[model samples]
Target chain A: NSSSMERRDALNSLTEYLPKFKWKESKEKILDIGCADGSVTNIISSCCPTDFELFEACDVNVKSVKYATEHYGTSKMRFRVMDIESDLPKEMKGKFDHVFSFYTLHWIENQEKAFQNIYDLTADDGECFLTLLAQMPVFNLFDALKHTEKWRHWLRYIKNFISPYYETSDPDVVIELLLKRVGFRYVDVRCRQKKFEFYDLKSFRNLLEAVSPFKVGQELQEELIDDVMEVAKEMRIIDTQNSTAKLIYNLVVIHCRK
Target chain B: NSSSMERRDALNSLTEYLPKFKWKESKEKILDIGCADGSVTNIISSCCPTDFELFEACDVNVKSVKYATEHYGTSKMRFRVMDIESDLPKEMKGKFDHVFSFYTLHWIENQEKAFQNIYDLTADDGECFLTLLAQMPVFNLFDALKHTEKWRHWLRYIKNFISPYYETSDPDVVIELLLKRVGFRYVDVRCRQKKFEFYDLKSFRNLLEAVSPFKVGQELQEELIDDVMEVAKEMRIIDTQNSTAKLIYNLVVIHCRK
Candidate 1:
């Protein structure tokens, strides 16, 4: 429920790339996109370069943005409701020296516009680093669950929720080309396979609820999670041995300059 | 409670003063302080000059500010959580051409700091219009309820909740002195008596709930409201004749220029 797995994954990824970043020498303004609940954004701020004086984050969910603003915002840090697909505010154009996003971009169906907005938000020599899901084992579970007679009507639009890059054979080239086309001077993209494990069925169920495509009451939600767990085991997307479930997924990490 | 009474009261006050006010010639940036739930702010915005380009409102209650932002905010109007006594953001200093607040100043204990902050937020030659309660019949109800053993423990700090200016015999002179001390070049203040009526006990109970000093659950809160109604009747603060409750109170209206 706390997004522990995503936080750990983001931190580990940041640790590997932090040294390679060419940060601005003076005080910098940084923006984090799609900062759901601000936990990962808080972790990112802790490890960020010392020159960061302004840290702003945004989310499409107003409730999550409100929670983040109340819980994580300080004098120089703020969280607000913003949509990447919509036309952004002119006051924010080219205002950020650096931008970062983790485990968020795959939710956007219009990848081109999202990258263009990121480019517009970045300063002349600024960089943006992001990690997005390319293909996840969870997609298989969604597919299986959405086809069932009990859940088919409820998850009629599940395909739109799945990542657009899930079926692509070369995510690195595809994502890199898109970034370069959006006026980026340089881009580097790589796809990596990451392994994650849930110690018990409860943890697995919690993850399902956190990412549920449909809103349901607590009792019905538990029933849906049971179905998801059974489908995952049947599809071999999650291997269970001695009560532990292990899974693997693909992520595309990108670094680009404006 | 929907705060409908406060909204109508604010609109009437604004309508009376709109013709006498001096508005800027060019596009103006207007601010509304303590805009709880944004109802009054929305009403004020509808009657504002057409050239006003930016309108912003703030409240100390995060939930109310969030609701206001969702319900009333637009491309040019914004609602955010802010406290008048706190050191405001530098970006907001000298940003507003005119500031208006209604029925909110009596809640703040630090009157000097609030006026000073308001002065700082106003641009050069800008103005601020405000309405604050000097003395109210509800305060008598609060005193009556807090002295009872059943409610005394819950309302231990009732005096702190009461307005500091509640006992002032000459509110006009006192508030004018404070504004002049806060570096206002021009100040006008007056006290007026306004009479309000609630058709039945239910309307009276709703008002009590809206301005409750303590947070409680629904059932317990209803019981507290019943006690408050009985105390109001005992103190004769609310005259219930023919199933109508009549209340009269003093309000301080202020207009100052920076």
Candidate 2:
């Protein structure tokens, strides 16, 4: 539901790195990891060179994989359900010429295993481009909300919702080292602070609800959003006036060669 | 829920023809069409010889495919969302050594395209095994329901629910000829009469409800089932006692060689 915003952000961010990619002229098999709903992946596929014949994407969410397969799957594009933390399918090992992930690695608590899987999935001399959240003010709001008695029960697993790099002093270096440790020969990582401006509170609320980990009933859903907004305002991470609101976050971009 | 019944029937029917077929000792890629929920597909995989690897199955229902992938999918067994009547994926052309479909082909209105796609999917000298409903008494009830004033609006597309071969005088011959027409060198199709005796009326109701096309609310679901049972009894295809019920239907088993 909030994927339109994500898709816009992903495409915008992708353009920054697209020109740097060394694409092969021959038929290339591409793999997109954590392609939830495949909206961004579909756009990425359209941007590929004609010789890039096969694009296989996967997500941990089965429903999203199903929707992606139904709406975007074809002879050249396939979607599957796969967990990055688990042992990946051997059939897909070293099968992808290029691996791409957007806004997904942050959700994985075991960053080491995820990078290892990515390295394993890439073919010899293949490249990988990834963008993931490093720090976000909204995560602090989730932490603050966890202390509230009203929502504490629902936020018991709040740690999972927060990125491990949220508190890191140098997230870019951390990620660069991790990627190199996972067998990437050449690695480049950069962190950027970004701002998203929502024209209205409705959009802000919808985005929050879409990303929220709490399973509150509809009756209490708006209340939880409001409480989160209150915390966000206190932390100065979100600025709201009348209808408009703005959110600030930090994300990391990583490029690597296998 | 009724798939338990289908699975049991399919396994029983498959045993009758399994020993008659010649199977290669080398690794074989398999495909299972209309594998909703993948329960039967999983069992069938276990029954295959050790060298039979890479079992890929697909279903038209997106939710069923999602559920099947979550519950039964693995590196060796993969599930996908695919429609048999539509153009199959070119990447999978001639990729399967054996294709199997159980109780799914009858749901498709176009048998010609389905068989053709199945043939196209099979590798050279591959085989296919399928079992589908040729005639079912429940189809008469659906036809009867269509003429009823109460359900006429809802049953406007009831024709889609009834198998194309439901009224054929010689379904086995028709199917055998179609398989051969679709490029199968050797084809054998046989229609067999079968009866399912539900130990209780509740089980019968559940089965009918699970298989019903009508989208009725909770309040009217039981009412619709009752109406169906009443119609079935009049057609002499169903026999109901105090708590027990029996349903009679005709099904065809097909074996083909490429």
Candidate 3:
């Protein structure tokens, strides 16, 4: 469910955002941070043809990076292995004319550092464009609260547990702070919301598997899982027509000059 | 048009093949060649426990390798840069217990060498599972004849172009050659044909763009593209309900001992 949603959303977002930039001329040196399956990259490539002196895409998840490289790699573009929180590559530092990221920065533990790295990679007058999960409505808040309360300490033991990855509801503050700290000028942050209703609880679970924190967590018991699913289904049928549920997502489109 | 058709076909093919393999046990030590996005790798990881050890995924495209490494990289699994036709990495020689390739292999210019490399990397009693496009129902014949006058020369050129990627549809000849050349102790090959119907010519053309060799040839023209779409539309409305297009894919599952 989330996988399908993400694929569709990525396509929609790319189609909307890519053309706004003069990609044919300014995209000669480009980078995509958190470039997933290269779906976005492929779209960018198809939309414009540039000299593309350097096209580098990167992400922390090695599998995704590999997939992006393989699917999107060509004579015109290159992909590299890098982490947002880690040191920027010497060759890549302040090298790109445009740095593009979509639905990826929210997972980084240190948003400030990641933003700095992105800024450091941009040349003078270069631009950085990013879209990520901002504020989204939460259903099954009862269930999430209960689970968090019950597993509070145990959950914390897991690496990346309770990290920024779960802070999906509000991300504007982090974005604002990071952008300011990174010394980006003419920063523009736009916020939007998205709501999605699940047919049943199973659909919600499926969506969970497609997004962040929940994607990394271990599997749950069948009974518990089913209970969660049933609750979601009941909420949809009883509370709203068409499986009524709503999620609000804040989209921040930042245009900044180095 | 071609993009939509290709997507539909590919989706159907993936659905049919994804569930056939017994992945629970062998996925731990798996190697995926031509792993475009690590989609298969992600599926395997999600289906099993975290204890699954050492999934090595590779492709010739550096960008894809980076994507895979970024998205799916974990201690238990890794993505690396590799060209299947080149010499197998010494560290990986005879290291994998299971080798899996999907919708690849047909792109390799030298099928024998690629197969040999796969065989070399598989451990004793390892299993090699593969799915490739077969030369069926006159491969790309329509395009060859309709597009240009040099039909014969075009066929030769197209054949040369695709030869690196797929083992031809001649199961008997191809299987025997693979066994003899790769030195697999026991081999079994099975074939299947898949047909997909498109709503109209536009859908078909969309499918083609989704996974088209025209990108490689650089021969795509606006008028020719429109004509192809028109032809597909006519076929769908007049020829069959929804205009069904047929393709034959030869599925070969080979298992061998060291």
Candidate 4:
């Protein structure tokens, strides 16, 4: 009755994302950048049994870095607090055979550097798989939050807030170019949204609260919350019975090779 | 070395708070109210073996509840979504030999009913253990964030924001009165702060972000973060060789008998 697969989260697609590479029995080190809490890193380590060596998970959030290490770290994996905006760690340069970045790249405002950093970490034959926000379909649902005058002040930080996923309209081409710039042989970027369903308004509210970026809306101003509440309230379509919010993530899946 | 016991978060004191109760070799049914992800519940459950028959854990966040049920469910333990401000589940009324509520009560604004609900869940001979914020030492650290008239608009919601913990001048006595008012025969409340140490400012900022209530500052305004930074900078006695900012919590440890 309580299968979490029914509820969608960033790392829930570990199976689909992890198997993209043909892993071999001769020890493959995997990297999970933007690995929050390392739950996904540990899960991926457990899921792929034979070819596994170690999962190197990292995040800019030191607290989360500490947590993933504390809760899920074992002899098989390591978690680090890293800023991909900076150079990839020297020890990790050209190390990972398969790099995973799920729901993390968007957090780095400097996407150009982030893409290069991921490439540098990739071994000669290594590949990087990323599922990240490609574009936010945020204000489309709450157009008044942006288009109107009085509420224009409301969407003030909207640009900075949504900068993570809106790297470019042609995110795939950009990612491919970046991969080629780093000497990767192959690249694929697929754009799509994983529709998240919620049976109740409460779940939708909780989802917004749980996601890190949107929680920023809570402190910007009370009006921001009021605006979100209006969107949430209007989203509750009890007659058609669809309360599910399509996070309309400007989502892109990138697989890069080196 | 990376065990998060090295990192400090506001609500991470479950290990110290949970061990306060001594369990005996009697068959017991345990209930952890507001158990976030069942991480602590499972940890505590493993620690106290013979006195346990079952552990029923619940949380307001359905996603967390589902995650707990999915990852940790077994014959001896279960997780659900239950609200303490409301009526106790019929099957669970008077069913638990030990009720655990750690770092959860302050979220419920209506503490009066929450205390009564906890009492209802306790068996006739059962006891409930709770570690909660009687008041957060938030403004105390950010006095300029409060005292300065320029930030007066920013601190408007600060009252209700910290109201959950700052119940009165004497929080322990008030909580004991509330528990006894709920018909508990005996009550004990102890107050103390767990000293938090950080070697850097980055770690302290991350600590503020991870804590539940303070994250509310993120969206309301950017200045809230600035104010926090100001506090963090001033609080740093780094030249004197101490990089830690002690988040002195108005923490309470309550043991109530039904």
Candidate 5:
């Protein structure tokens, strides 16, 4: 579920950011870290006509890396599995002029280390452009659902039931701090807010299941699930008619130079 | 790198596929199964105004999902973190009217499972549109590069590394397999070839890093790396004079009904 949600966010953001990079100038070398299925990477290549020197895309998910490499082929570009926290391939050191990561950094437990690693991988005067979730209402909604009378009981019964993960500003602050610590000379950060709506209760549930919080959970009582569905349905109608039900999102875009 | 390479290939293939699907229908529910960063979603959103009931975008990458949900917002669409290879989210089941997987499906390890999941997820009378790699030279190139000596080692090594992952088929066989495996009543499979050039050795290296294959390896003999660079430079010079050495690709498109 987290995977699906993050992919959606990255797709939306990349459509907007890729064009701003002046890809023609840097088409010779571009890197997309955490590139799942190479979707955004494909988008970048299609829109810009510059003869690319090389395109490096990577992700920790072996399945995705394999699929991307196979589907996208390996002529002017390549795909491979890579863990960002680990040292990058020695050959890739100081290689890329433009490193673009859409909606990828927020998931890291150590956002600072991730940022520093990206900073180190880029060439001198190269630019790193990325977007990730900041403080968002989704967490509030998660808390509300967790604390509710019915679901609260499950929290006690299930061991390692919930893997704690959320995007908070403190993490973003640490990332920014580390960017400077790693000697990035220029850094810019901005946040934006947006809302999404669902048609009915079933749609909302589907949407939720498509997200991580619901996907990882064990099956619950059908009636309780119905209750959750009812709440979501009611929220949607209200959001549609009275403008009350909303998923508030905080988006952060960071642009820095090494 | 495989990552950068896929991006380039996906982009190169997009222009050839975008026009194949019709966008004039009213009340269309567009599902981008592995949509990373909403690049194509935004494009679809802008080109069509058909009530756009749902922009069902999903991915397994958390950072990308968060970014998508945040950037795209939910007003017009929703982003989720979903693993399509797993059970379809209960909410997502029987929901979408039209599913589009541009350059995404090849990443799934279990192709049959992925196809069945998509088939089950689609509403009755729904359609699934996809673009994947067909029999292409890159796979062979990758195979040959693996055994090549220093001057040709990079190409072979990179190709050999990624060849196993490619799910290549004759156009007819791919279409027949989808129909037989997924129970599509009407299935269409076709292939196309596109070519693009990368200038100079340095520029080519940039493209390589932007992809995944190069990023996956940690060490390389300096002489080998330099030799590969020289070959690329020579190819670039030849391409400049003969307008050749441009990379070629084969794209396969499959459209089927539930």
Candidate 6:
């Protein structure tokens, strides 16, 4: 259903933003960080395709790295479980002409070290395309947590438990974050908004369970979990009459040089 | 500063799919639903300097409607406070050559009627561009609300207290909802993702304050809001170090014809 004819009206618009700028290189080496399943990696590879394409896809999630490797990996393209938070492996050091990420980078902790290594991994005067979630649901979640008993206790230990990997509403903030390490030159960053629609809360929850590092009822007692969902059901925020749900994610895209 | 330079990277990409299949209209009559401040409506007007332009902008929020009317309203473009959930205003019925909404519609209530009204408002052989929030934050926020006492008791009285307008996560559901009305001829819907970054939990909260219709703590006891904000501060998901915070939104875009 990814075909143009099959895609939803705006589904086709989703990819227009990625590969925002095209700079060609012959047999250019490309690194895709957190390239899970390589679905977007495919789009990235196709974006302004350069001649003699050479690309590497990496994710710390070994599960997805193996999945991408098995599904889309080829002699021309490879997948590895390389976390840039650490120094680039010897073979990968300064090896990529362009580093790209889609729906990744937010889960990464230790942001400064990661970019330094991203800078370390770029070989040519190449560019890096990174887009990620810049805003975390904190106080909102904080308020909701205090609303529930199980979540209520977390507030007492708030400092220890609450931390989301990617955060920033401003791209210049990210550009500033990236440039703090003298290894980067000019970076162009912009904030964008895009939301997804699910047909039902069940469908919405399906995505919620998958992307959310914090799962409801996973650690909480069943009784309270049910109690919590009971409230959610009562709210009817999902529009059962129409079968729909939506979440807003604000994103920043940064294309920079090392 | 979402200027053309910062915006074109993706802004250029947005209209590609919207007007991908445009039909000629003699002196196009455009209707813009939920035109807050006419920022993107301005972009829409600029998208294609149609042969003739008569655009009407509307929003439920009087503050925004007034602001848009004052700034962008002219003989060519006018602003109104007409809610789409209801039938179109008498003068507006069957008048628009093209109808458009950008990042609106998720907040609307009564999805089917709104579409019916939209269909009623469109002239014969007219088109509509609607992109909405397909995923609603239910148990997601339900969890957060459960964690807060102010939001907790509201749960017991849930139906009366919790009302977040127009949340849906599914596109086909909406298309199907639209189809039931027997107004629109054809529709194309899409699911897309864009993440926004926030510099601090503080910044994230700023957006929450503005967008969320439910002000959970606004009327709450000071003792509680202080406690809530206090706990929220400690969570400090914000990396004052790298400066980041983030949220992910999945969006659905729909293109339709009468």
Query: Which scores better on TM-score, 2 or 4?
Result: 2
Q: Order of all candidates by lDDT, from best down to worst?
A: 1, 2, 4, 5, 6, 3
**Which tens-of-lDDT digit does each residue in A1-258 have in candidate 1?**
647657777887788889988876777888888777667777778888667665554554456556745476666687777777788788889988888878852345677777888999998999899888765557556655776778878778656543445545445667887787787997988655455777787777777777766566877887888888876654444444456565545567888888
The global Cα lDDT (0 to 1) of model 1 is 0.71
DockQ winner: 6
lDDT minimum window of 10 residues, candidate 6 chain A: A1-10
TM-score of chain A of each: 0.89, 0.87, 0.73, 0.73, 0.69, 0.72
- Candidate 6, chain A: TM-score? 0.72
lDDT of 3: 0.53
Question: Against the hidden true structure, what lDDT does model 5 obtain?
Answer: 0.55
Query: Model 5 over residues B3-108: C-alpha lDDT tens digits?
Result: 3444555454455455655553666566776676565556655654356664545454446555755576556577767767676667777777777676642333
DockQ of each: 0.00, 0.01, 0.01, 0.01, 0.01, 0.05
lDDT score of residue B122 within candidate 1: 94
Report every candidate's CA lDDT: 0.71, 0.70, 0.53, 0.57, 0.55, 0.53
| Candidate 1 Cα misplacement greater than 4 A, ranges | A1-258, B54-60, B157-164
**What is candidate 2's CA lDDT for residue A157?**
64
**Each candidate's TM vs. the true structure?**
0.47, 0.47, 0.41, 0.42, 0.40, 0.47
Residue range A1-258, candidate 2, lDDT tens digits: 455645765787788788888877787888887777666777888876547655555554556556745576666677766778788788989988888888752346677778899999999999998888754545645655776677667677656543445445456667887788788998988654445676776777777887776677899888888888776654434443355665545557788999
Report the C-alpha lDDT of model 6 over A99-164, residue by residue, as the tens digit.
765554235556667677777888767777766555433223323434455565654543333223
Error of 5 at B250 (Å): 48
Residue lDDT tens for model 4, B1-258: 211322233234445555556554677788776665555556667755555655554555546546755476566576666778776667878887887777742345577777878877788778777777653434334533454456657567765433433534345656777777678887878654333445665666665554424434446645566565664443331112354544423456677778
C-alpha RMSD between model 3 and the true structure: 25.7
